[PDB]
Amino acid sequence: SDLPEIQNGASNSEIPYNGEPLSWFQRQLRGSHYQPILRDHICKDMSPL
């Protein structure tokens, strides 16, 4: 639920989080500290159809 909005065919590997962790679970996988880069929030470029 925390991850910033992306659009079909997103290719930028490193991007800012733009927001804090929302769920417990999120807090746990991001670490009890700050980290700027969000890595691999990239999704497939699906056919226009």
Residue 34 to residue 37: CA distance in whole angstroms? 10
Give the x/- contact pattern for other proteins in 14-33, rule: CB under 8 A: -------------------x
Query: Is residue 34 a contact residue for other proteins (CB under 8 A)?
Result: yes
Q: Which helix (H) or strand (E) holds 15?
A: strand 14-16
Residue 38 half-sphere exposure toward CB, CA atoms < 13 A: 18
Residue 36 vs 48, nearer CB to other proteins: 36
Residue 33 vs 44, nearer CB to other proteins: 33
Q: Which residues bind other proteins (CB under 8 A)?
A: 33-36
